Amino acid sequence: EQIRQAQEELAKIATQLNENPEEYPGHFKALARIGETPILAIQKLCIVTQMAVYKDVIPGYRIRPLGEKEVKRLRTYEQALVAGYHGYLKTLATYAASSIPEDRKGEPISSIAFTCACELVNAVPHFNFRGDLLRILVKKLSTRKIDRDFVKCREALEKLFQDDEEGNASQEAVSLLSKMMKAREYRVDESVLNLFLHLRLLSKWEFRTKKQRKLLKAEKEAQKVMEQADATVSHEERERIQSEILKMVFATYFRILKARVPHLMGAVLEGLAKYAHLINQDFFGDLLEALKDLIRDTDRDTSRESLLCTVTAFALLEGQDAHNARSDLHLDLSFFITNLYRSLLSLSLNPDLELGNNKINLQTTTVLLLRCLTSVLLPPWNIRSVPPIRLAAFCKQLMTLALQVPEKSSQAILGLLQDVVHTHGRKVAALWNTEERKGDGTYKPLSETVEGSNPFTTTIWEGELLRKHYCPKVREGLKAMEKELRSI
Amino acid sequence: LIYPLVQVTLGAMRLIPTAIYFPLRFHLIRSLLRLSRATDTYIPLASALLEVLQSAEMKKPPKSSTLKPLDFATAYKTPKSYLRTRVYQDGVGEQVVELLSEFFVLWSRNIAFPEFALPTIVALKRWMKEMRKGNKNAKLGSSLVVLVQKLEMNAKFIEERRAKVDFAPKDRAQVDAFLKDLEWEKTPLGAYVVAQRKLREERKRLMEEARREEERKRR
C-alpha cells in the first residue's frame, strides 16, 4: 500500500545515510516530509526510523551555529543534522503531549515516542538540545500517575544518572527536576526524589619517514602537555559541577522539610543522610540542629516522623568521617537519646506500630524503633564502651515495651535484647540477678533523663508475664534470653 | 489452638476502628477477657482500650440530647442519631472503665503488675490533663480518676510485698510462689472491681425491673 511505498522510501533513506552520509544531506528533511503523512502506521515507523538514523549519525560532539569543498560539505551536512534533529525533538514532544488513548492496535504513538526519547537519552546525551529531550522526560514524570511510560522514563533517567561521568547532563537534569518539584509544590511520587539518590557524580614495524617521525614527536609532547592540563581542568570542573548539583539537591531537600510534606520525608531524610558527608562541616552541625527542631516541632504520623529523624541523626553520626569528626565538630546525640527514652512509653501504647538495601526510608514504625535501638545500644563503633547506665535503662524500658506491644514487634524486641545481652552480658547481668541490686536510691520510672532514672536499683520482673504471652515465638525468644543469661 | 483465635480476634477488632463500630470491638474484648480469665495466656488489650479512649469522639464536647442509653449486648452498629450524644459518651466511658477494670484485676497479682500498669497510668494522667486543660464529661473524669488511683494503689501494694523475693536466674522458687495464698478480693484492685461489679449489678436490676414496670403499665 501507501504504507509499502513508505517502507521502501524509509529503508532507502536510512541505508543511504548509513552508507554515505555527507553525499546525501537533504534526506534529513525528506524524512520529516515522509513522516508528515497522516497514516498512523507510517507515522510510527517514521518515528522509529528517525530514532535509528539520528542515533548513528550524531557526532561525538556538538557543533556551533555558523551564522556570520570538503569543508563546505561537512558544514552543510552538520547544519542539516542539527536542523533535522531539532525537528525530531519537536515531533517527539508533540506526540508525547498528544492524547494516549486510541483504539487498541498495539503500542500507541505516545508510547513509541517515549521509548524513542528514552533511547536517545541513554545513547547520545552529549549532543545538543539535551535540554529539550529532558524537558519531555520531566513533563512525563511530573503527573502523579504510575504508568509503563512513567517507569520507562524513570529507569532512563536512572541510567543516565548512574552513567554520566562528565556532569553537564546531570546538572541540567537536576535543575529541571528541582524546578519541576518547586513548581508542582512538592506533589511528586517520591521516585523522582530517589533519582537524587541514584546520581553517580555525588559518590609490527611501520615504516615512517624522517618528516613523519619529527611531526609525530611534535604531537607526542603536545599531547603530553594536553593530558596534564586536561587532568587538572577535569578535576576542577568536576568539583564545580558537584558543587552546583549538591546545592540544588540540598535546596530541594530543605524546602521539602520546611513545607513538611508527609509522603516525601523518608526520601528527603535518606538523601540528607547520604550527602551530609559531602557537604561542609558547619552545615553538618546545622543539619543536626535542623533535625532537632523537626523533632521539637513534632512534639508540639508524629511518632513515625520522630523516629525517622532519630534514625537519620544516628546514621549520620555512624558515618565514618562524622565519627572521627565527633569531638572536633561537637556533635552530641544526647538530645536524640533522651527523646527516644522518653518516647518509648507512648510508642508502646501506640496501636499504629505495625501498620505497614534501604537504610532510612522504612515504612514500619516498629522497624524505625528497632533501628534506633540498634543505634543506641549496639553501635557500629565503640560497641564495648557504651555506658552501663544507658544499657540498663534501655533494657528495662524495652522489657516494659515488649510487655505492652503486639506479637511480632515484641518478638523483634526480645531478639534485640537477646543480642544486647550477648554483646554486653556482665554489664547487665545485675538486672536479673537480684542479689546484685544496688541500694543507692530508688528506681524512678517516669524520669526525664537516662542517668536520672536509676537503672541498677531495679529488677526485670516482666518475664512472669511474657512467659505466658499467647505467642509461642515470644515465649521461645524469652526462653532463649534466659538460656544465654544462664550461659553467661 | 489459642494462638489463631487471638490472632483473628485482634484482626477483627482492628479491621475498621471507628466510632460507629466501637461495640463490636467491645464485645470482642469482652470475649478475649473471658478467655484470659479462663486460661493462663497473656493477651495485650491495653492498646485496644487506650485506642478506644484516644478515639475522635471522646475529644469534642458532647451533644445535649434526650434519647435512650444503648444496650451494649445487642448492638452491632451505632445509630446515626448517636454521633455526639452525651448518652453515648457516658455509655462508652462506662464500659471502657469496665473492661480496663477486669483486665487489671485479672493480672492484679503477678510480680510485674507495677510495670504492667505504668504505661496505662501515665496515659490516663495525660488524658486527665488534656481534658482539664475537650468536653465537659465529669462522670467519666471522676471514674477514670478513681480507676487510676486504684491502679497506683495496687502497684504500690505488689512492690511492697516484692522487696524480698530472690530471683536468681537459676533459682525461681520464690517467684513461682509469690502470692499463691491470696485471692482476688484482697488486692485494692480486687476490692474496687468487686464494688464496681456490685454497683453494675444493682443498676442492671434497676433498669431491667424498671422496663418491666413500663411494659406492664403500657399493657
Binding site: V367, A412, G415 | -
Partner: peptide, 20 residues
Amino acid sequence: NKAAEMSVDDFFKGGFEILS
C-alpha cells in the same frame, strides 16, 4: 543477628499463622 534479621521490613507482613 536477631536484631537485623527481624529489623528487615519484610518480617512484618501480617500473614495469619493458620494459612501456612
